[PDB]
Write a protein that holds these residues in place. Structure first.
Motif, short mmCIF file in Angstrom:
data_model
loop_
_atom_site.label_atom_id
_atom_site.label_comp_id
_atom_site.label_asym_id
_atom_site.label_seq_id
_atom_site.Cartn_x
_atom_site.Cartn_y
_atom_site.Cartn_z
N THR A 160 0.96 -1.30 -0.11
CA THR A 160 -0.13 -0.09 -0.01
C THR A 160 0.84 1.23 -0.07
OG1 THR A 160 -1.63 -1.21 1.31
CG2 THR A 160 -1.97 0.98 1.02
N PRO A 161 1.18 1.87 -1.14
CA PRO A 161 2.10 3.11 -1.12
C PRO A 161 1.18 4.07 -0.36
CG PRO A 161 2.18 1.82 -3.24
CD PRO A 161 1.09 1.31 -2.52
N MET A 162 1.82 5.21 0.00
CA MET A 162 1.62 6.40 0.66
C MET A 162 2.60 7.49 0.73
SD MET A 162 -1.22 7.67 1.78
CE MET A 162 -2.24 6.51 1.49
N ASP A 163 1.91 8.58 0.69
CA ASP A 163 2.79 9.84 0.41
C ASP A 163 2.10 11.25 1.19
OD1 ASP A 163 1.49 9.67 -2.27
OD2 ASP A 163 1.78 11.52 -1.80
N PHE A 164 2.93 12.22 1.27
CA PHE A 164 2.01 13.46 2.11
C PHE A 164 1.11 14.02 1.00
CE2 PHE A 164 5.55 12.65 5.21
CZ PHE A 164 4.67 12.57 6.28
N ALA A 165 1.44 13.97 -0.26
CA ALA A 165 0.48 14.62 -1.22
C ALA A 165 -0.83 13.96 -1.28
CB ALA A 165 1.20 14.87 -2.57
N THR A 166 -0.85 12.54 -1.25
CA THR A 166 -2.06 11.82 -0.88
C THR A 166 -3.02 12.16 0.32
OG1 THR A 166 -1.03 10.12 -2.56
CG2 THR A 166 -2.90 9.49 -1.26
N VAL A 167 -2.08 12.24 1.39
CA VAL A 167 -2.67 12.58 2.75
C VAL A 167 -3.39 13.86 2.44
CG1 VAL A 167 -2.40 12.91 5.19
CG2 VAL A 167 -1.21 11.06 3.85
N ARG A 168 -2.73 14.83 2.02
CA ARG A 168 -3.23 16.40 1.92
C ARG A 168 -4.49 16.44 1.04
NH1 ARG A 168 1.18 20.81 0.51
NH2 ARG A 168 0.86 21.65 2.45
N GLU A 169 -4.11 15.83 0.10
CA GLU A 169 -5.50 15.64 -0.91
C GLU A 169 -6.78 14.85 -0.33
OE1 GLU A 169 -3.86 14.01 -4.71
OE2 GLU A 169 -2.04 15.20 -4.39
N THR A 170 -6.56 13.74 0.29
CA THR A 170 -7.78 13.14 1.10
C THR A 170 -8.24 13.89 2.07
OG1 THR A 170 -6.38 11.04 0.59
CG2 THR A 170 -8.10 11.05 2.55
N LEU A 171 -7.46 14.63 2.91
CA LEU A 171 -8.12 15.67 3.81
C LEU A 171 -8.88 16.67 3.13
CD1 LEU A 171 -8.00 16.39 6.79
CD2 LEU A 171 -6.09 17.81 6.11
N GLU A 172 -8.30 17.40 1.91
CA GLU A 172 -8.89 18.36 1.30
C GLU A 172 -10.08 18.05 0.69
OE1 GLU A 172 -8.45 21.78 2.13
OE2 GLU A 172 -7.58 20.45 3.47
N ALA A 173 -10.33 16.78 0.27
CA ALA A 173 -11.48 16.22 -0.49
C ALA A 173 -12.66 16.04 0.64
CB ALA A 173 -11.12 14.71 -1.16
N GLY A 174 -12.35 16.03 1.91
CA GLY A 174 -13.46 15.48 2.75
C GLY A 174 -13.45 14.10 2.99
N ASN A 175 -12.35 13.42 2.93
CA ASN A 175 -12.48 11.85 2.91
C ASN A 175 -11.90 11.19 4.02
OD1 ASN A 175 -12.35 11.40 -0.78
ND2 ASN A 175 -13.73 12.21 0.36
N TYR A 176 -11.55 12.06 5.06
CA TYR A 176 -10.96 11.68 6.58
C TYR A 176 -12.17 12.11 7.22
CZ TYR A 176 -6.01 10.92 5.12
OH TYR A 176 -5.13 10.33 4.39
N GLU A 177 -12.49 11.08 8.14
CA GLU A 177 -13.95 11.32 9.15
C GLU A 177 -13.17 11.58 10.44
OE1 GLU A 177 -16.53 8.40 9.83
OE2 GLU A 177 -17.86 9.84 10.84
N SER A 178 -11.59 11.54 10.76
CA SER A 178 -11.11 11.65 12.05
C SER A 178 -9.65 11.87 11.77
CB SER A 178 -11.70 10.59 12.97
OG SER A 178 -10.91 9.56 12.63
#
Ligand SMILES: Cc1cccc(OCCCNC(=O)N2CCN(C(=O)c3ccc(Br)o3)CC2)c1
Length: 121
Positions: free
Chosen positions: A45-63
């Motif tokens: 499962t690749p992950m990076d900080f741009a993906t984290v920021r975009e998931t946050l800005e999309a409203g796709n983290y609940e917590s």
């Protein structure tokens, strides 16, 4: 401090600080398979900080716990891939993880406190 929504801007602020850190530069964008052709044999499962920021800005983290799981995955992937505990890039991951953990602890505590206050009655 019982604002249930405050974690989001606090996480945007902390991601901004991580993007200024020179230690983040290898973790900003998804790993390039061209340079690291065995990467996806090791990392499911690749992950990076741009993906984290975009998931946050999309409203796709609940917590903030969900955001924290994805950031911790960036660091566990660097550990899973390092050919050596003394690699430059793994060494950068360890400093950046210490910084992240120092700053995320109050974000998590305040969020969890706010949810408990919401359910107090
Ligand atoms: C187009 C463009 C512009 C700007 C940046 C960009 O991205 C930079 C390359 C992304 N990082 C990267 O390649 N890696 C980071 C994750 N790895 C490890 O954690 C690791 C542990 C030990 C060793 Br060695 O590597 C594997 C290497 C791409």
């Amino acid at each position: 401090s019982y604002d249930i929504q405050a974690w989001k801007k606090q996480c945007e602020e902390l991601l901004n600080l991580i993007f200024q850190c020179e230690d983040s530069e290898p973790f900003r964008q998804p790993v390039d398979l061209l340079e690291y052709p065995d990467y996806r044999d090791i990392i499911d499962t690749p992950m990076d900080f741009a993906t984290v920021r975009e998931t946050l800005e999309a409203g796709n983290y609940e917590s903030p716990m969900e955001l924290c799981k994805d950031v911790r995955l960036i660091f566990s992937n660097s550990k899973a891939y390092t050919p050596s505990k003394r690699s430059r890039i793994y060494s950068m991951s360890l400093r950046l993880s210490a910084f992240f953990e120092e700053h995320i602890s109050s974000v998590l505590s305040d969020y969890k406190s706010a949810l408990r206050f919401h359910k107090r009655n």
